[PDB]
Amino acid sequence: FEKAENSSLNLIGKAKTKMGIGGLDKEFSDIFRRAFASRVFPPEIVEQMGCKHVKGILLYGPPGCGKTLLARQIGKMLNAREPKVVNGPEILNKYVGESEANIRKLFADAEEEQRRLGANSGLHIIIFDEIHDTVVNQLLSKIDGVEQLNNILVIG
């Protein structure tokens, strides 16, 4: 079986069977690779490797270098459909409780899917554009610990 080119249908198993970004091919290749390849080898290889999957990859660039496009593309490339999560700039909009809870909450759906099916094989991609008190800790707690929280990746 083979998914119809550019389809959200992500097939897994053994019964199966480069654009567009100007420049940024060696660095991109290695990075794309380190995060995705470790995930990609199927499936015993990771245990053979015995390394837990990466929590996140972060990019910092001079302005106008078109970072955003690379990120949307990388996310698209990674999964048939994550399907992509976009975070508003305010992130924290709504003062009363509250917002902080929202930053926790988008994470919450992904963690819930993972607990429901946790082992294999669900991946959720969340991206924060333009990334104190609670939000610092809150993001940190969800991204790592106390228990698990793996099987998702986030790019800043």
Partner 1 sequence: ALSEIETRHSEIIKLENSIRELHDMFMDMAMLVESQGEMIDRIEYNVEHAVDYVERAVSDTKKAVK
Rounded Cα distance between 130 and 149, Å, is: 23
Rounded Cα distance between 58 and 42, Å, is: 25
Q: In this complex, which beta carbon is closest to partner 1, that of residue 10 or of residue 138?
A: 138
Identify which of 51, 54, 49 has the alpha carbon closest to the alpha carbon of residue 34: 54
In the complex, minimum distance from the CB of residue 108 to partner 1, in angstroms, rounded to a whole number: 18
Compute and round to an integer the Cα radius of gyration of the chain. Answer: 17
In the complex, minimum distance from the CB of residue 94 to partner 1, in angstroms, rounded to a whole number: 8
Q: In this complex, which beta carbon is closest to partner 1, that of residue 98 or of residue 109?
A: 98
Q: In this complex, which beta carbon is closest to partner 1, that of residue 96 or of residue 119?
A: 96
Beta bridge partners, 56, equal 154
- 3-class secondary-structure state, position 41: coil
Beta strands in 26-116 (DSSP E): 56-57, 85-87
Q: Which residues bind partner 1 (CB under 8 A)?
A: 96-98
In the complex, minimum distance from the CB of residue 95 to partner 1, in angstroms, rounded to a whole number: 9
In the complex, minimum distance from the CB of residue 96 to partner 1, in angstroms, rounded to a whole number: 4
Residues 150, 55: contact at Cβ < 8 Å? yes
Q: In this complex, which beta carbon is closest to partner 1, that of residue 52 or of residue 94?
A: 94
